[PDB]
């Protein structure tokens, strides 16, 4: 589980 994902499109 990744609470700090890559958010950028």
């Amino acid at each position, epitope marked *: 589980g990744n*609470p*700090d*994902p*890559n*958010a*950028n*499109p």
Partner: antibody
Amino acid sequence: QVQLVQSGAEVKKPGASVKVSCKASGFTFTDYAMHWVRQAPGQRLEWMGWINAGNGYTKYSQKFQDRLTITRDTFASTVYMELSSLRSEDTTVYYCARDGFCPSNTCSGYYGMDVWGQGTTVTVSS
Amino acid sequence: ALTQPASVSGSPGQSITISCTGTSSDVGSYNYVSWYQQHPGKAPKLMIYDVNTRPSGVSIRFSASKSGNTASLTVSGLQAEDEAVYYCSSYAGSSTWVFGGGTKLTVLG
């Protein structure tokens, strides 16, 4: 200094379009992403979408997907928002804001809108 | 929209807390909760990012945390200059972001 400078106020008729620019200075443009966020008088911030300044990939809020485009010009270090089919509810202040661009699979420390333009007022009225 | 109280007030020198309740899809899922302070006629200023990190230059009187689906900003040693509207925000997945409805902070006196 690090700043975002937006274009000036606009008055538009319903069904028109408006194109606002946001010119960046003081920092490496393609290291970042840029959001557009807007705010009706006396009301909340509303997220519209963002673009990666380097690769130009975008994501729009589904509320705006049909009538919003965000574009960038790296040589001009400028981001644009274009909002079509304007309606009275689009009367707001529009802001551009800098955020991070992460190349990794884990991205703590990248996000947070740390630099904001001064806002552009758009009035939509018949 | 994330849910915030419409207003909070305190007296000078006291502490106040502002809650921001989302869903397990945003606040409950990610460490990308930010808080913004907005004074009338000006753009928002970032006060907290990554749930609890203060950006450079922001006063240690501002701190935040989250528990489950609720994030909380605490302002200690209230000063008149802290009167503003405060917004929380969160990542919401699929490269989208969401703001709270804002809380007007009144300093009594």
